[PDB]
Design an enzyme around this catalytic site. Sequence first.
Site, short mmCIF file in Angstrom:
data_model
loop_
_atom_site.label_atom_id
_atom_site.label_comp_id
_atom_site.label_asym_id
_atom_site.label_seq_id
_atom_site.Cartn_x
_atom_site.Cartn_y
_atom_site.Cartn_z
N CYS A 87 6.17 13.33 -27.95
CA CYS A 87 5.12 12.35 -28.21
C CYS A 87 3.81 13.12 -28.24
O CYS A 87 3.28 13.50 -27.19
CB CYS A 87 5.07 11.28 -27.11
SG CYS A 87 3.66 10.13 -27.29
N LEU A 88 3.31 13.40 -29.44
CA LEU A 88 2.07 14.15 -29.58
C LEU A 88 1.40 13.75 -30.88
O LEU A 88 1.96 13.96 -31.96
CB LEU A 88 2.38 15.65 -29.59
CG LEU A 88 1.27 16.64 -29.92
CD1 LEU A 88 0.13 16.52 -28.93
CD2 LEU A 88 1.85 18.03 -29.89
#
Length: 153
Positions: A87-88
């Site tokens: 998750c970035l």
Amino acid sequence: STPARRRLMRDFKRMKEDAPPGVSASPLPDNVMVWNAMIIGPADTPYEDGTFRLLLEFDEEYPNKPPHVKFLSEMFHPNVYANGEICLDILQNRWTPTYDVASILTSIQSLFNDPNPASPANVEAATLFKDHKSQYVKRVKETVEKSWEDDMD
């Protein structure tokens, strides 16, 4: 060869020569669309010296569209899901065509030195990090060792 593939060749030259510290990556000798990479668990973190491997899969929309990136190694980090996905924002809505393998790897590397995501992918890791930091580290150390056993196989 296509625009994307050539760009990828250029991203490879940069990794061959000026590869950023702690990060390494390389395309398969026969397919530039699939790359293997590894980020050494950074300095004074409980991730220290872990050999965390990832898999990057590109397509012909690169670099306008980011590649699919996931960890192949077992991970325990608030920003990493169970299937290894990360998750970035950099990898999602905040992606820009100026990014390359190097920058992708460094941005992910940076997460190790900052387990403070707003909305965690790995909720268990986030809670433990806040509440029982002792266990979080114990668990993180566990994945660091596991990354070492992988190499021995």
